[PDB]
Every structure is written in C-alpha cells, then in structure tokens.
Enzyme design. Structure first.
Site, PDB file in Angstrom:
ATOM      1  N   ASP A 121       4.684  -0.964  -1.615  1.00 59.10           N
ATOM      2  CA  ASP A 121       4.102  -1.782  -2.477  1.00 59.10           C
ATOM      3  C   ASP A 121       2.679  -2.384  -2.330  1.00 59.10           C
ATOM      4  OD1 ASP A 121       4.930  -3.259  -4.532  1.00 59.10           O
ATOM      5  OD2 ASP A 121       5.385  -5.348  -3.260  1.00 59.10           O
ATOM      6  N   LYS A 123       0.396  -2.747  -3.438  1.00 56.50           N
ATOM      7  CA  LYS A 123      -0.716  -3.468  -4.361  1.00 56.50           C
ATOM      8  C   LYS A 123      -1.942  -5.049  -3.424  1.00 56.50           C
ATOM      9  CE  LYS A 123       2.959  -7.192  -5.470  1.00 56.50           C
ATOM     10  NZ  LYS A 123       3.720  -7.720  -6.036  1.00 56.50           N
ATOM     11  N   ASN A 126      -1.277  -7.287  -2.099  1.00 58.74           N
ATOM     12  CA  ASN A 126      -0.690  -7.028  -0.175  1.00 58.74           C
ATOM     13  C   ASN A 126      -1.594  -6.727   0.440  1.00 58.74           C
ATOM     14  OD1 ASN A 126       1.886  -8.163  -0.788  1.00 58.74           O
ATOM     15  ND2 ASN A 126       2.937  -5.553  -1.472  1.00 58.74           N
ATOM     16  N   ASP A 143       3.366  -6.915   3.214  1.00 60.16           N
ATOM     17  CA  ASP A 143       4.210  -7.270   2.675  1.00 60.16           C
ATOM     18  C   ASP A 143       5.593  -6.105   2.659  1.00 60.16           C
ATOM     19  OD1 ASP A 143       6.221  -8.528   1.560  1.00 60.16           O
ATOM     20  OD2 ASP A 143       6.021  -7.644   0.283  1.00 60.16           O
TER      21      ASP A 143
END
Ligand SMILES: [Cl-]
Ligand code: NA
Ligand code: NA
Ligand code: NA
Lengths: 285, 281
Positions: A121, A123, A126, A143
């Site tokens: 994840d 992105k 984050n 995260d």
C-alpha cells in the site's frame, strides 16, 4: 488510555482511526492508531513494526495497548504532514531533491523486501515527514496494515534469500514508479483529477501506456524517463527490483541531475487524482 | 512455579539442564537453568524455534538470579549414541542426517544466524525412534545474529566475518560427516589427545580418506567430506552447495551396508577433546 490524553483526529479508515494524543507523564505529542480488534487483526502489522520499526525511515512503534475491544498503536507523531504537501508547495524541488526522496524510500523498501516483507500500500499519503524541515532523512513510511511477511507453510518467516512475492514486490515498485512520475511531471500518470472514474483510470493502467513527453517531460532528464518507464512497465515481472532502482544512474549520479525547480499542477488536483487512482485499484482488488 | 522440577539431565559451564513436569497439563518438559546474557539465545529461539529441527522454546522465566528456559524434552538422547549403537547405519542413513541438519543450517545462515557450536553433543533426538525428522539442534549460546550498526537484523543477501563464521558451521558439519562415515574423528584418536596434537592436525588441513574402511566408502562421500573440511575456510562449500551435492541428492545410489565404527566412548571422547582444543584457541 491512563497515560495519554487524546486530542483531534488526524485520519480515519474503515477499520481504524488515527488521532493525535499527548503523553501525560512527559507531555509530548504522539500519534495513536485506534484499531477495532472486532474487525481486524493487526497482528502482522504489529510484529512487522516491532521488528523493523527501528529502521530510520519506517514509522517507530512506541507503545501498544489492547484493552480487549480495541488495539492502540502509539507511534511518533508526523508533524511534517504528507510528502506531496511538502514537495509541491513550500519546498524547493528539482530532480536532485526528487532523487533523494526516491533513494530514501527505495532504500527502505529494498531492506523490507530483503527481509521478506512487502508493503502493498505504498501510496504517497502513506509517506510522511516527521518534522517540518522537508529533509530526506525525515521521511517515514507509515501504514503497514496491508504489509505481508513471507512465510513457509509451517509459519516460519522467510527471506527471498532462502511468484506471489515477486508479484507483490512489483506492486511496491509500481507505486514507487507513479510517485516518481508525479514528482517529475507535476501530475499523475493515469488520472487527470479527483473526478476520474475507475473506468478511465483502469483503461489507462491496462493499456500499459503513459506520457513521457510534453509538459515537464520536455526538459526532464532522459535518464529519469528511462527509470520511470522501467518502474511502470506493464508486465509486473519485468519491472525493476528495488535494488536495480538504487543502481540506476538517476539515483547514483546525483551531481549530474538538473537543479531547476520542477513545475507542478495544483496540489488539490494532484492529490485528488492520486486518491482516485488508488481507489480504482482497490476496486479491482 | 507452574512446573515441578525432577531429576537433572545434564550440565554446562553456564547452565544445568533438568527434566521438569508442567503442573497444569502434567506434561514432561526440559528446563535449562542459566546463571545470569542468554539475550541473543532467547531472541534466536523465539524467532526461529518454530523450525521443525530446532529445539522449541516453550516458556521463559527470569526471577533475577537465574533464567529458566523451558523447552521440549529430548527423549532420544544424543546423535552419536544413536547412530553408533542402537540404530542400523549406512551411507543412506548418514545422508539423511546430514540433509536434515544441513537443511536447518542453510535456513539459519540465510536468516543471518550462525550457530558457531555445532558439535555432535548439541544434536539430539526428540524421541527414541532414531528418525531423521526427530533431530533437533539444541544449544544456541554461541549463536550470533547478523546485525547492522543500528541493531537492524540483516540477511547475508542484503549484505567476510560471516563467510568465515558460516564456514565454521560447515566445518563442524564436515567432521560430523567424517565421523559417521569412518567411525572415528578426523583429528583426534581418543579423549586423551592434547590440544597441541589436535590443532597441529587441524592446522595441516590433512586427514585420512584412504585405506581401512575408506576403501568401501563411496567416492562421492569422500569428495564431499574433503570439500567440507578444506583448510581454507573461504574455500569450503556453503550449506546450499552441500545440499546440492550428489551424495545428498541421489540417495538411491548410496550404499546400504552397515558402517564400521569404533567404541562409542572413544569417539565421543575424541570429539569432545577436539572442540575443547578449538575453544582454547
Ligand atoms: Cl513537482
Ligand atoms: Na524509525
Ligand atoms: Na495516476
Ligand atoms: Na521446533
């Protein structure tokens, strides 16, 4: 709970809400991720943070609470806000500063991959700064709720040392690739704004095509284009590894990089197009 | 105390191992009593102790003065007791032993862990069956986890001392191999060999691979032993390379006749003297 006073809310997901809290004893500001146990098991997230959270560019876990119903992750408070807010606004930003960002982040992902951990994840939202300086060393990956540790059938942790992880690693690199694309172009490769539909975005992604000409690309260095195009390659098993990214001339020969400010589009457009892009991707997942 | 302590099983210059019984479930375990830094030992066992052939850590206590490591009880006793006495033993069964152990070492190495004390007395059977899958590696008090300056765990891949350290694990595997094949140790003749006799032999990098029993041991086993015991530590095989050797991979071609061996106490004595000489240096 007995040692922190909770302040405002910073962000909020479908399983958890991150808020700013203050340590009572020492009166220092921290961030707490409040996760509903009765909806998720952060078990792997907690293990990964305890194990690798000592890495300078991975958010640091400072305390863990589990009153039974909820689980509380206390971590360092990211006072510098998100990456994009910084580099698209206050901070002087050319290819040279971009290469440092990629290097700091790419280096942290290379470490993680080598330990058998994929983030999944990555992105831009984050990736945060611990303080308002905008210094590369202040970057944090924040995260790990989708992160997965490579394991044997019997639970044994394993390293790539000892096709799904090669696929998963490729996803981490692809994310790095679109972040790179954005830093260079001042816009996202597969979306034009926050109002792009999953249909528009997934068609573009599926075509495996993106612009490497026009706008900023007309002055952006040829070697950056080369790197972006190999990070975003349509066939996931043909993208570069993290190691190969760190060995690219765009990353290793920084003294050769242009030092002129990069043009960028409105900040709210870019973050909007970025969110729409990951929303489209979560959809087909 | 959720355990009742029974008799003593063994000792160590920094520990004493005894058999204890879990009160709640009334099941038999083994407790290692250490005179207080088992820190790196405890971390390694918690992290990799799920491997089928590494002893399993079941409970840890620290009342302050002593540390209590509760682990599975090794009812099968030590490796050598088994393979030199109460078990049919040919090159085929030897290759299984090396494979089980070498596989567990290859995993450890890949995780950045070196054991550094792989002597036969540290390799035990969990039960009296003598089955390969029942092998356990049992003492990690010299084991070292590869770390960055800031404490970060690291694997050899991401990353000359570990190549030297791994080579020591392979060398130990090599002398165990040598012994299983020859029925005697390569650098000592009995428990009465002096450190000077033993280290001179080890230093020369020479040992017997001919005449006597060696005349009926397979060529490929000789080939493997000689590459595990190579005098220059950076020229020995990796664990991976050992597991890729034909002696390990083509077991159906191995001889199946019982191996000659010397008296059991002589062999274990020469083995202990060999590691005593090495600790000295
Ligand atoms: Cl920009
Ligand atoms: Na950190
Ligand atoms: Na996009
Ligand atoms: Na085990």
């Amino acid at each position: 709970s007995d040692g922190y006073v909770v302040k405002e809310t910073i962000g909020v997901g479908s399983y958890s809400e991150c808020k700013r809290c203050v340590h009572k004893a020492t009166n220092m500001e921290y961030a707490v991720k409040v996760i509903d146990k009765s909806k998720r098991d952060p078990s792997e997230e907690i293990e990964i943070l305890l194990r690798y959270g000592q890495h300078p560019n991975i958010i640091t876990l400072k305390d863990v609470y589990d009153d039974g119903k909820h689980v509380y992750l206390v971590t360092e408070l990211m006072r510098g806000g998100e990456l994009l807010d910084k580099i698209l606004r206050q901070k002087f930003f050319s290819e040279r500063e971009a290469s440092f960002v990629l290097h700091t982040i790419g280096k942290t992902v290379e470490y993680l991959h080598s330990q058998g951990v994929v983030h999944r994840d990555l992105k831009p939202s984050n990736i945060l700064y611990v303080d308002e300086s905008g210094n590369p060393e202040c970057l944090r990956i924040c995260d790990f709720g989708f992160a997965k540790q490579l394991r044997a059938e019997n639970g044994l942790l394993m390293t790539p040392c000892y096709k799904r992880q090669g696929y998963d690693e490729g996803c981490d690199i692809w994310s790095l690739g679109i972040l790179l694309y954005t830093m260079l172009a001042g816009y996202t490769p597969f979306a034009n704004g926050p109002s792009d539909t999953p249909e528009e975005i997934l068609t573009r992604i599926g075509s495996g095509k993106f612009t490497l000409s026009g706008g900023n690309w007309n002055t952006v260095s040829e070697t950056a284009k080369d790197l972006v195009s190999k990070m975003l390659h349509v066939d996931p098993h043909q993208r570069l590894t993290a190691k190969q990214v760190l060995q690219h001339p765009w990353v290793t020969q920084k003294d050769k990089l242009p030092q002129s400010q990069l043009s960028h589009q409105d900040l709210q457009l870019v973050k909007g197009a970025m969110a729409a892009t990951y929303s489209a991707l979560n959809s087909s997942k």
